[model samples]
Target: LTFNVPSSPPSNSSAQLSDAPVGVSFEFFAFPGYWNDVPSTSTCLQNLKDLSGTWPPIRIGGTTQDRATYDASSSQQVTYTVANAGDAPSTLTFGPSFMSLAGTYAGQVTIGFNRRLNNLANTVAAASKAVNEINSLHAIELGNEPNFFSGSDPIAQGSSWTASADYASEVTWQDAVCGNLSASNLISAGVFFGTSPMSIAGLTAVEGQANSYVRQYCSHNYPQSKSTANLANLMSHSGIASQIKPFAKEVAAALAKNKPHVFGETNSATQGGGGISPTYGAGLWLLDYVMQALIMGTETLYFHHGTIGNCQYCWWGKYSMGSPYFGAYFATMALAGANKIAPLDDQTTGYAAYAIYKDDKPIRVLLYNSDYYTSGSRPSQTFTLTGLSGSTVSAKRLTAAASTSRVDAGQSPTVAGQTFENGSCKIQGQSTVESATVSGGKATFTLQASEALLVTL
Candidate 1:
């Protein structure tokens, strides 16, 4: 619902608006582990503790996130079974674009995710019944896109270390069988964009405890500024968002040995998600990909393809790329916890707006207000959120309007009629915002052009 990136800079330079409290994360790709189906683990862990509740621990993982190895020519090796080692299959949601080409050579087809959690005949009794049906969802991201192992012959073009030594034997066989179950269960490998210190030294040379692994780098490609010569040779000069602070200081000095970094899977745009003709340059590429992954230190930042599936979808939303642009970029926050204080400056528009404090209050403030793209049809836009002065809000508006960006080929998007207006809302173009307020600390709200607004205080 948001894909902002138009030379971002607006909350006024090095942005800041603190009183923190905003921590949210989501990157589910276990889609019933590719088809053996199983995800209602107590209504998806009570909707992940109703979106960011029990603190920052809700990572499941999938979409080819890596973690493989044992290959002898590829029967797709997966050894390690307390019969299903860590299972979950039983909900039913099949794929392979829905089989049928004689159900693809008749293997009865299982698409992915540990071959759909190895069809659960007991993967440790379906991971002990999906870990007691989710109560605070510990953490999981075994594999999802093992960097496509860079293959192209002439020596695998820019190899991914034999797919990171088959994904460090699926992260040392799921941390020696789910880290002996408890130390607060955790398992990560679900990488995202690109990085290959020789595939992280071939996952620390085939998992020799490369400093106890736990790294999640996910970027759904959003730092592009168009310089095609065949996409500038498949791109990746760290893909550039001002090169995310030297790519987070070279991935925190090559994982400073390892364990503690999460971007897990990002999204601002790559074309696949933002459809129905989306562009104000994807509402300024989601405010410069959330200020370049919070200036590239990326402790957390999940977005990827915010779902609806087969029908309504979005790269990020404001309202109708069918509903999830973080619910209209969290209606312009005035609250987004878990302390991150700093960055506050603005004089005209180099752009700025960052503050998600907790305890010391100032719940939210992350405006990136992306702008550009205007052909003078003048449909609607008013945008005015200038220093709250007396705030009062509870708003939400995600506009990629032109009648809800893409959906034609059979049209869909009706997943719950969405609209919220309080401290003023209008912008009817490319959208973003979820305005919530209670200000006496300076504010102003109005959005109606190539849009972006999140006025909460």
Candidate 2:
């Protein structure tokens, strides 16, 4: 993988991404535990803050978002009853504490309320309570993924709940929220949309008739369905673009409206599966995935995480973290400031490269060799970077045992010289900069299969 870094960056017109454009998304049902129960989870959040120099933003909404109901207050923050033992709590309820729990977070948070139940009084009050309680609030989304509401569920099918009617409901809800709170500040800045069955085309129509109440736009993703997911596809640069194609127009709408387009609820697979979704290779894919999104003008990305279910795909397991976490570490390490990104061309599958620029200067060049392999002779690719600031570039590897390395299999991937094995939060590994040989106005580094080399020039 050879990159001819231009002496100067291309048009400096790419959107300048946020210093901390990558964050973690959580399940609406199980987030409280992730926030309050574990020591490592807390450590992990703080670790991200230290690395990114900003509190990693938090997104707390999922399918359970719309299914949940809120009371004025509860002694315990969360409560639920199980219809099926293996699935989510069928009937879940929370109170001010549950909503307010979002505020206790160190980062900005996007919470949710029940819009599917169609209870205007509770929806408004829920918003009022969460807004009143959450000082660290991002926004309280009304519903999770109403665009793809189930036909059998019959809510979206009802005339009473028609798309036309829903907007009116939202308007009424927003009005009351404005009246009750003496401020419309907490109301729909914009409707953050859904995934798995995303309808960005429908969102475009919504954006067409969008009002001032909505200020931001968001969309969700899982690179592939569980049935079709594997390491090879996850690392395929084309696969990333194909999954994001459905929402390409949404980007145009966002840019035109002069609003930030957020990449929300992202995981490599919609439903977690074995083999690759939770493996180190997925981390490499995530690094490339996030870089591609950055290049495409996504202002921020929140990787989905929570209790891994039957079709489990999350940043970490119940006890150990993996690919998704690797993505964040490497991503933040590579793109750590307000800057523009340019993708360098290699014209091949399983390999992608990027140039990170700050102040119109090429600060870093990444060589991603994403070929998937577990054993035998490793497929290593040599990267040659030109136009570097100086010879002997500082380089670091984002890798695990192999591309097929799984977190559950005791594989711990590393980046910037740290690992989160066994949920240990302490970033015990000091940042160690390794040198890459450079000569004659070029730096050469060889990265093994399923590894990414971050070259600091």
Candidate 3:
């Protein structure tokens, strides 16, 4: 397959996307609990900060966020587990420790609060206290999946809850928050919407009351439910496409309304990724997913992670050890700090290409092959990148053996023939610069199945 790399920049200004739009999403409980021991000197957090170029904004909320209660004191809380309530403990609370950890790497932090209290006084106290503590506090959300509340789930909704009632509660919280804090500061500390669809009446009511105060309209997605997920399923482009389209409309609507919609908490699978969600295949899936989202005008995609819990799709482990989930880390490596991107229209048997630009010049070209069946059956395809403005070009492969290996047979994904360990990378293959060749205005390479190549020009 061959594609042309244009020397000119994009004509449309909106096509320029920023790394600031690509931040990480976390379960509020992920911190203040498992990450409580993670000190300010943790290398894990530093590596992420470097990957993002600045402190990436952190959305500290998920299902557990709605259930969490804030503890103003400096001590840690006693945490315990719950069955069928996702990964986090039943009773989750955070104090100064969590905010301190957040302040270390997060330039801006969006904190979530429990809305079941349904009292404007409680919401104001919880949100105001967090804003007062973290100077970087950016936004607040009332609850998580308020769309799924049944008025009976004690953790989610209390008695006699309805969508309209929830909207009312949101306005009350907003009024109190805006009243207590300066309107300008409150505007910067915006409000994030729900993780799933709220009722039309509820949505209209909240948007009508707090439209200017809404910083981001949030949503959640998982390509498949946990029970029937598998590696092959996770890597299927058609399957992933089906799941993403619904959310894509939400993204378009949010943008049309001039509000940035964020896929606040999302990964390959719900109920903590299983099957291929944590494998090298997941890397391919995730890389393609983020690229496609950007191409489709998604403002941001925040991958979810937990420390010592259900979703092992994490960058670091307990005690701040490097537990690099190949897919998660590789995607970040390829896309981080990319300021502009243009999707190549050239279509191969089962692959695609994208050009990432910085300073209006092509810095990296990402090539991905979705053919993940039999290794021998998948033939290598050659790609020629034309219209090169640079005399020298290089390539790096983010890949592992067979896309199924886990912790063995070259399991972890590598970039430029290296894999990261303890915030640094160890070379495992030929150097990226050493393996590249450029002639005239073109560079050529072969991409194997179930692999992605980042061509630097």
Candidate 4:
């Protein structure tokens, strides 16, 4: 089977930014590599900049400040947040910033109140200052995992607090901070969870102040033994819907009652520290996650623990050798854009395709061929996009060998017709491709095994 790309990138893929795009918020761990490894931070800047148009409201975080101790002496400082985020904003300024910091630095830098004193004033000041620099920053996650960082905030140490009190803390903080600066510039103290209702213990703590349209991030750490069925249930369809309803209900209630923009973040089971998973297999999982997040109507999706350790099971797993899966993850991010749309009802299969809509009715059907465990090579699949009464479309295909190589989506298609040619695009045995053909106002194409392609209709 072959792959194709639209002669012209789908015009519909660039729709309004307000309409949530299929986006990916990646975690960079503060330092992806030593500064010396590459000259001119410009390289990473340009790379992220290139994909800037695909996903706006990209949230980024790192192991910048340690919550355990507010030790400002470790390459870290009052400016750790600024340092960690670096010039990426100057580099990729097309969209909003979704960022948060390790609260440790907030104490000494602002008030030096070392204890778990809400330190609301100081924390807010630091976050405000750092965020002010990037106008595109949309959400500011107050702290990392509040539940896990109990030591810093004694209440987080499995402390049982009433939702009212938690809400008050958040409200008081918001009022103290956002209560002034143009209401549009403020966000809430974001909550990060792998499941929803979140936890009785946790939800109860923050449910009271849930009055604001703050944000919610749902993550899942699926166990290794989980099967496809379990995956569908826990990480796939209805299960995900079920898991998010409560929080969403709370958010909806808050927004209806109040008025805050909602969102999701830092997902991935990355369950175990065990064996590496198959490359193509993981790609399928990633694609699945992307679709699940979009269908949920989430404003944002942050990939947690991205590009971390080795093992395909983990999002940060290694592909060939030293190269991390960052590029692969980036590829997925580029493929998920916003705009108009159509869904390629391939639910019965592992592969999924989407007709991403953009300005002027141009459409891009991004597809991911993930049936790798059974099909060693990319499997060819077709998509039928509705609304193309009688217009011809063009196609292109993209693929690559591994992490270190560049993604080559077939040549810039020049033909104008319907039904693009297959195999015209080539991906490594288990890679990704996108092809398209336009005829009578419609475009159609297929993706090969382990390949992720985008066909504009």
Count of clashes, each model: 89, 5, 1, 61
Q: What is the C-alpha lDDT of each candidate?
A: 0.36, 0.69, 0.61, 0.37
lDDT of 3: 0.61
TM-score of every model? 0.28, 0.89, 0.83, 0.59
> Where is model 2 poorest over a 10-residue stretch in terms of lDDT?
188-197
Residues 1-457, candidate 2: write the lDDT tens digits. Answer: 5677765567633567787888888887778877676556777777777866888888887778777887676677778866553467765877778776788886778876676776667777877777778888776566766665544453454554445444455555556655666663343233434432344334435533333444456677766676777778778666776666656676666667566677767777764445567777777778888888877777778887755443355665546666557767788878876377787863356667788888878877877877778788887877778766555778887877777776667767777567776665566577667797677788778888878888777
- Model 4: lowest-lDDT 10 consecutive positions: 106-115
Q: Write the per-residue lDDT of candidate 4 for residues 133-240, one digit (tens) a residue.
A: 444445555444333334345534355544444444455555555554444334434353433324322443454544342433223233233233232233232344
Candidate 3: count of backbone clashes, pairs at least 3 residues apart or interchain = 1
Candidate 2 vs. true structure, TM-score: 0.89
lDDT of 3 by residue, 58-87 (tens): 777777766666666637633446665344
TM-score of candidate 1 on Cα atoms, chains taken together: 0.28
* Global CA lDDT computed for model 4: 0.37
In model 3, pairs of residues that clash are: 283-327
What's the candidate order when arranged by decreasing TM-score? 2, 3, 4, 1
Ranking by lDDT: 2, 3, 4, 1
TM-score of 4: 0.59
Better of 2 and 4 by lDDT: 2
- The number of the candidate with the highest TM-score is 2
Q: Which parts of model 3 are misplaced by more than 4 Å?
A: 10-14, 38-41, 77-87, 117-119, 153-169, 184-206, 237-242, 307-309, 319-324, 346-349, 374-378, 390-392, 408-410, 422-431, 434-436
